[PDB]
Symmetry: C2
């Protein structure tokens, strides 16, 4: 089956996009990125935002652990940095510490008593105080024997305006390169040329990281690659890169109904 | 000040984008569109999704009423239709009835004991059972003496693939035409030509509805129009349309920090 990852958490409620456990139990995925954590440039404690899934999300603990015991990695995505004009000391250091204590220590945090597998950073502005490359270095330097995987979700334009610094730390394990919404590098009908060139650029410029092609599971989004096109044209070309890792599915909501991941070649 | 509307509800928590009351109290807006209600093609009761603002959102009642007593209209946006392959009878009729009972009757619904001012529909796929134009007609035909405003948020491409049928009912009071993210009709630096042509097309083809230009409040989104450009170039041209209504701000989160609406001409 290879490496198929998926985004979950912003697809509504359990009744719209299914529970996290449902996603894991489906067997389609070996890694889930939870969307998303809101962080504060002024050092306020982060706010978890899993939409209509839960407000008290501590009961997700058992679902996270179920996933992990099925060998599925669970990463939490930082999706929003609330800016401040205030000059505040130690914001990045303090966030790294908050994350370590609340998600990577088995202690009672927002997702219950878990050790998550890592942190993803979305392609969004950082703060005047909070800096993503600094955060990545701090997390990798964490006082723990646990493996904390670090990743980013850049758009397919290289370099990514928001994440290039974090990428150039050379400390990201995975990149979920987004080939959806309107960008010059998406697939369009009968035209993979820009996507191929972007994949060449990403894989060659970030040889230290595993590169996922993040694709939409629905034909209602720009960048959609029909499964036969993905299997017979796209994958044969992009898999020539030694650091091509697989496909990231945007997102569990669309995939739950479309069963796009089911149609990807073995 | 004219007509300035804003989207609120998907900007995170109260600490990231402020409470609904805060938005109303700011005095920047005369209409707020709440994002968003999830509806079900199989006829399941809708799920309210105001992200990390609340799960039990009934306590928003007092904030809604505060807004309304300040002459601010509150509309709820349908943002997501969860599809089904099942053929289910009366889905649209039943949704109209659910909305009437739960948001337009002063009874104890998901937002408490309110009479909302109306419903907006996002530019998203409808269902195999649930149909937007049918929903608009049903809501307008509601057994009530209350005014229910009906609107849609089409993208700037005319016709809108998802909402054109709803628009052609001629029963929409407002259109929030979205000139952001990547589309051929957005403003780009020193180039309003496509936006002007789109505004001509929207205003001339939908003379029966008031047309808002929906614009991003942050320079970090495609389509951003610096306030001086908006005031001295854009508004003088587009305001020549008799049905040009004003500016819809995407969104309260960005506007809270950027104070974009504050910079729009009187
Ligand atoms: C920081 O990154 C380094 C390098 O990827 C990680 O170090 C590896 O850790 C694994 C398991 O602990 C070992 O098998 C490797 O031999 C290590 N490699 C090197 C070069 O030291 C380290 O674990 C990361 N830190 C965290 C907190 O995950
Ligand atoms: C359906 O649309 C019609 C037309 O806009 C609305 O009828 C208007 O109602 C207002 C206030 O009740 C009156 O001042 C107008 O004279 C009416 N116009 C016409 C042509 O009848 C009607 O209110 C809408 N239905 C709902 C539930 O809002
Ligand atoms: C495979 C896996 O990740 N197992 C985790 C374990 O590491 C952790 O000690 C525990 C308590 O938080 O949750 C487990 O089930
Ligand atoms: C607060 C903010 O917007 N910071 C941005 C940062 O996100 C971006 O990666 C960088 C690129 O050089 O430019 C900064 O201005
Ligand atoms: C101006 C306004 O909309 N006022 C509303 C009123 O119509 C409604 O009867 C009441 C109870 O639900 O909430 C009010 O304050
Ligand atoms: C379930 C679904 O996707 N329905 C779409 C509808 O949203 C769209 O407005 C219409 C345009 O003709 O095409 C239908 O296939
Ligand atoms: Na879709
Ligand atoms: Na921004």
């Amino acid at each position: 089956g290879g490496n198929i990852v998926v985004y979950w958490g912003q697809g509504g409620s359990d009744n719209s996009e299914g529970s996290l456990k449902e996603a894991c139990k489906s067997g389609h995925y070996n890694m889930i990125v939870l969307e998303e954590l809101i962080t504060y440039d002024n050092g306020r404690d982060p706010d978890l935002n899993l939409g209509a899934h839960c407000v008290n999300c501590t009961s997700l603990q058992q679902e996270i652990k179920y996933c992990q015991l099925k060998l599925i990695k669970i990463l939490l995505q930082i999706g929003q940095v609330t800016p401040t004009k205030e000059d505040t000391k130690d914001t990045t250091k303090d966030l790294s510490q908050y994350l370590d204590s609340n998600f990577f220590s088995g202690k009672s945090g927002p997702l219950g008593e878990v050790y998550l597998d890592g942190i993803d950073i979305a392609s969004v502005p950082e703060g005047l105080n909070l800096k993503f490359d600094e955060l990545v270095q701090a997390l990798n330097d964490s006082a723990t024997s646990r493996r904390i995987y670090l990743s980013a979700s850049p758009n397919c334009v290289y370099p990514d305006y928001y994440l290039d610094k974090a990428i150039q730390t050379q400390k990201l394990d995975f990149l979920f390169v987004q080939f959806f919404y309107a960008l010059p590098c998406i697939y369009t009908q009968g035209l993979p040329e820009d996507l191929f060139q972007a994949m060449k650029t990403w894989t060659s410029n970030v040889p230290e990281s595993k590169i996922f092609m993040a694709l939409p599971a629905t034909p209602d989004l720009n960048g959609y690659i029909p499964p036969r096109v993905l299997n017979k044209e796209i994958l044969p070309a992009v898999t020539q890169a030694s650091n091509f890792a697989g496909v990231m599915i945007f997102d569990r909501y669309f995939d739950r109904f479309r069963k796009y991941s089911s149609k990807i070649k073995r």
